[PDB]
Each structure stands twice: as structure tokens, then as C-alpha cells.
Design a protein around this nucleic acid. Structure first.
Ligand SMILES: [Mg+2]
Ligand SMILES: [Mg+2]
Ligand SMILES: [Mg+2]
Lengths: 44, 456
RNA sequence: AUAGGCGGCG
């Protein structure tokens, strides 16, 4: 859960956009083989 | 040999005009129409272009005929395009002496007092001539055509010709951004300039009227329509843009009248067919509104006729111009309206392989395919695939925003069947991120991450 | 080169 924790740190500083990016990187990986294509949009 | 001499010539053969094979029937038809119906000062340019198109078709003697017709009309410096086209013509046929004859004529005129003395010559006229050829060869050549005219207006800012060319290129590029948010009327002041300096030119009046209308100035625009319609200048073209003006004002029947009259002169115009499609589409929407979606008896009869009529004309448009993206999309959607989903689909698949000049047009393609996949084909995965694909195209637009909202609605539907879904939670988090709602974005992403760790 | 109806447990 390294990327979750990186997200929380940004969130707690107010970098909502870097917070989203960190979580995206991990949720991308989880959803890389998802049929919609959301996993790839996250890992760009 | 002579071939390196040819490559220095400023003419159609060296201007790299972007002409798909697919756009050739249509371009020739538009060349012939211009020759017959456009009121301009010099018609040498368009016959030089007719020649080039014949040459690309594999009809060199016809190409030669068109160059001889241009010669028979021929300031004198514009003849240089004719002569360079002749040079290339005779080369490609294999009359190396005749090619050379014409190269030598170019060179002799290029010694009063030209800097590249050899075959190129730099003057406003040949600049404009490159502008108009690019401007007739489709949207991808438009930034270049604008630059040509603009080059000449950098030097001579009151040149009437290049002010026209510049203003028309600009209006058409403005056209590509009407769907984007924060589009500015970059062509409004150029068109005013252009009308001032070409006070007899109805073509330019009607585009000015259309620009005025886009910026909310209907009264002023309508004066320009009425003026333009009262002069011979380019009657048939004034008919098309006047029709567009009256349709957007909500005089659809008046539009049809003009369009149908113009169709006698120019039966082949994909502009006409498309715009006549839009008239029938707007009349279909009137009836659908007045009958609250439930037309019966005569109303249904009339609605059916107008759906058939739109399909006829949108079909007529894409047969003539297979790369006419917007006309394909309107046809797809008319097919949906008529209940023909395979025909819709078939037009959607051709749309998916196109490389639009107007990037926003691909957003519209995905948006509307996604809705086709949600509501007609009942396949959420493909709706989502395509709403995401539309969202992925960076450009801010109303249609992108529509795709975000369409994704939101579908994912909230899916979450209310099944709340514990990693994709759906991440998707809803994404949508909120694209709305700028960041607290919720992070809340849904966190929930998705916590759903992952609980499941393991 | 030819844009904008309404958009889904409607
Ligand atoms: Mg066309
Ligand atoms: Mg329209
Ligand atoms: Mg349209």
C-alpha cells in the first residue's frame, strides 16, 4: 500500500491532485485487465 | 535533370495539396461548380486546379485541355502557375522538349527582377494562388492557406484579394472551434475588413452574416443576407449560407426553399445535401416536440417522410464524400431515430476509422457511439469504453462534458445494483475528479482501495 | 468545411 500512503500525505497537505494521482497509480494496476480501459487511463 | 528545375516551380504540382483518393470525385465536382457559378475577378486559378485534378485522375489530355483554357483567359504573373503546370504536364506525358519550352518561359519572366532567378518567383499573386488551391482542397490544408494570405497582408494590409482569402480561411478555422468551449470570433474583424475591400462580393457577405449570427447579432447579419440575395454575385453560394442563416433563426421552410433552388444549379454539392438533411432533421424535431413524442395519423406520416428525407440527403452526402464525418454521424443518428440499428452501427464503424481534422469530432463520434451502445445495443461495457474514449480526448467541449455526465449516470446505475465493485467505485471517483469535485474523487478512490484490501 | 432538440431505474 505504498501508493495509498503517498496519497494520504498529499491529501493531508492539500495536494488533492497529486493525491488522486497516487491512488490512480495503484487502482490502475489493480484494474489493468479491466474491460472498460480505465486501468490504462490511470497508468498514463 | 529537367526534374530538379520542375521542383523549383511554384504551382499545383509542388504545393503538396492534401488530396485523398476518396475526396477526388467531390473535389472535381466542386471545381466544376466554381467555374460555372463563382463570381471572381480571375478564373485562371480554378482551371489550373481542374487540370491538376484531371492529372491525378489519369486523364492528361483533359488536364491539358484545362491548362489551354486557363492560358486562353491569360496581373500576367499568374500565368506562371499555368506555365509551371504545363511544364509538369508535358514531363509526366513524356514531351521533354515541350516541358523545357515552358520552363524557359517561366525563367524569362523570373528575370524581372526575381531573387531565386531560376524558376520560383515571389509575389503576392502566386501566394494568393497557393492560398486558394489549399483552401479548395479540404480542411487539413487550411492553416497553410491562411498563412499564404496572411503573408501577403503582412506586406500589403489592404490587398482586397488576400484579405478575402484570409477572412474565409479564418471563418472556416473558427468553424472547427465552435464546439470547443471559449471559442472567440477570430474571423469577425477580418470578414468586416474583407467586405469593406470587396464590396461587391456576396460570398464574403453571407459568411459575415453567419459570423454575426453566431455572436448574437441577428439583425445586422440579416441585412447582409438580404443584400447578398439581391445581387448576382455568387447567387448559388449565397443561397447555401442564407439557408443556413434562416435555419438557425428557425425559418426552416424558408431555408428549404433556398436549398432546393440551389440544388438545381449544383445537384452534386455535399454541402447542400447535408444542409437539406439538417432542415428535415429540424422539422422532425418540431413535430416530435408538438406531439410530445407520440405522433399519430397525419403527424406520424409527416414525421416518417422527414426521417426518410433526411436519410436520403445524408446518404447522398456520404456517397459523394466518404470522409464527410459530420454527415456520417447525422446519418447514424437518423438511422437510430428510424429504428435501423445495423445501418446506424455500420455508419458508426466507418466513423471509428477516420482521422478528423477537427479533433472534437472524434469526441462526438465516441459520445454518440457510447449512447448507441448504452440505449440501443444494451451493452454498458461498450458505452463506458466509448464515453471514456471521448473523455480521454483532452479538448474542453460541451460533448466531452456530456460524456462525463453520461458515464456518471451509468456508473451510479451500476452501483445501485451492486455497490461493491472496484471498477465502478474507481470510475465514479474518476468522474468526480473530471468534475473538479475532489473530496468525492478521493473518497471514492479510497473506498475502492479499501474494498480491494478487505476482499483480500 | 458542410456545428448546438431532449438524454435515461428518461
Ligand atoms: Mg465538401
Ligand atoms: Mg447547424
Ligand atoms: Mg450536425
Amino acid at each position: 500500500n505504498y501508493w495509498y500512503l503517498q496519497g494520504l500525505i498529499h491529501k493531508q497537505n492539500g495536494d488533492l491532485l497529486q493525491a488522486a494521482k497516487c491512488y490512480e497509480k495503484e487502482l490502475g494496476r489493480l484494474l489493468r485487465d479491466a474491460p472498460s480501459g480505465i486501468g490504462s487511463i490511470f497508468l498514463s | 535533370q529537367v526534374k530538379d528545375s520542375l521542383e523549383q516551380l511554384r504551382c499545383h504540382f509542388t504545393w503538396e495539396l492534401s488530396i485523398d483518393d476518396d475526396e477526388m470525385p467531390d473535389l472535381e465536382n466542386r471545381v466544376l461548380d466554381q467555374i460555372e457559378f463563382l463570381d471572381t475577378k480571375y478564373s485562371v486559378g480554378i482551371h489550373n486546379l481542374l487540370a491538376y485534378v484531371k492529372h491525378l485522375k489519369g486523364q492528361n489530355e483533359e488536364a491539358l485541355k484545362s491548362l489551354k483554357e486557363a492560358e486562353n483567359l491569360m496581373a500576367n504573373v499568374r500565368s506562371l502557375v499555368t506555365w509551371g503546370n504545363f511544364a509538369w504536364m508535358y514531363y509526366h506525358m513524356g514531351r521533354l522538349a515541350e516541358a523545357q519550352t515552358y520552363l524557359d518561359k517561366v525563367e524569362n519572366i523570373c528575370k524581372k527582377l526575381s531573387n531565386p532567378f531560376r524558376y520560383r518567383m515571389e509575389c503576392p499573386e502566386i501566394d494568393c494562388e497557393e492560398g486558394w488551391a489549399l483552401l479548395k482542397c479540404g480542411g487539413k490544408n487550411y492553416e497553410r492557406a491562411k498563412a499564404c494570405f496572411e503573408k501577403v497582408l503582412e506586406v500589403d494590409p489592404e490587398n482586397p484579394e488576400s484579405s478575402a482569402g484570409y477572412a474565409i480561411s479564418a471563418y472556416r478555422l473558427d468553424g472547427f472551434k465552435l464546439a470547443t468551449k471559449n471559442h472567440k470570433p477570430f474571423s469577425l474583424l477580418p470578414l468586416r475588413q474583407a467586405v469593406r475591400l470587396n464590396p461587391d462580393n456576396g460570398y464574403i457577405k453571407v459568411l459575415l452574416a453567419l459570423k454575426l449570427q453566431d455572436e448574437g447579432q441577428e439583425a445586422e447579419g440579416e441585412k447582409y443576407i438580404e443584400e447578398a440575395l439581391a445581387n448576382m454575385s455568387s447567387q448559388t453560394y449565397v443561397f447555401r449560407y442564407a439557408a443556413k442563416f434562416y435555419r438557425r433563426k428557425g425559418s426552416v421552410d424558408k431555408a428549404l426553399e433556398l436549398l432546393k433552388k440551389a440544388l438545381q444549379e449544383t445537384p452534386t454539392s455535399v454541402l447542400l445535401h447535408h444542409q437539406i438533411g439538417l432542415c428535415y432533421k429540424a422539422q422532425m424535431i418540431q413535430i416530435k416536440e408538438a406531439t410530445k413524442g407520440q405522433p399519430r395519423g397525419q403527424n406520424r406520416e409527416k414525421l416518417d417522410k422527414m426521417i426518410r428525407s433526411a436519410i436520403f440527403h445524408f446518404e447522398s452526402a456520404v456517397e459523394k464524400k466518404p470522409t464527410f464525418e459530420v454527415a456520417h454521424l447525422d446519418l447514424a443518428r437518423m438511422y437510430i431515430e428510424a429504428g435501423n440499428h445495423r445501418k446506424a452501427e455500420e455508419n458508426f464503424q466507418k466513423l471509428l476509422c477516420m482521422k478528423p481534422v477537427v479533433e472534437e469530432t472524434m469526441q462526438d463520434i465516441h459520445f454518440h457511439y457510447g449512447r448507441f451502445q448504452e440505449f440501443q445495443k444494451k451493452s454498458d461495457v461498450n458505452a463506458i469504453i466509448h464515453y471514456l474514449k471521448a473523455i480521454k480526448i483532452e479538448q474542453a467541449s460541451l460533448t466531452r462534458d456530456k460524456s462525463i455526465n453520461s458515464l456518471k449516470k451509468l456508473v451510479l446505475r451500476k452501483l445501485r445494483r451492486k455497490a461493491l465493485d472496484l471498477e465502478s467505485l474507481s470510475l465514479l471517483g474518476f468522474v468526480y475528479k473530471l468534475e473538479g469535485n475532489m473530496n468525492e474523487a478521493l473518497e471514492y478512490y479510497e473506498r475502492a482501495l479499501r474494498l480491494a484490501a478487505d476482499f483480500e
